[PDB]
Assembly symmetry: C3
Homo-oligomer: 33 residues x 3
């Protein structure tokens, strides 16, 4: 169960990094509107 949680935290970490880049991009696009 611990290895599985580790694998899941790793993908959530990567998803979080992506979302931050997307949110930063949207902030700027919403800015331009």
């Amino acid at each position: 169960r611990m290895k599985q949680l580790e694998d899941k935290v790793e993908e959530l970490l990567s998803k979080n990094y992506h979302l931050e880049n997307e949110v930063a991009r949207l902030k700027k696009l919403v800015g331009e509107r």
Copy 2:
């Protein structure tokens, strides 16, 4: 400890899912400009 971590990873997983749906929606509403 493990039950607590499981609960917390679930919380983050469902929060992440909600944010990604909203961000996907906003990308479309904002468009290119």
Copy 3:
């Protein structure tokens, strides 16, 4: 390993909260029409 996972999920939980506030703001700025 367990302490390390716990520490990482704590960090991600706070990062997720920040992104939710940003997304909430953008939803409002973008609007319904």
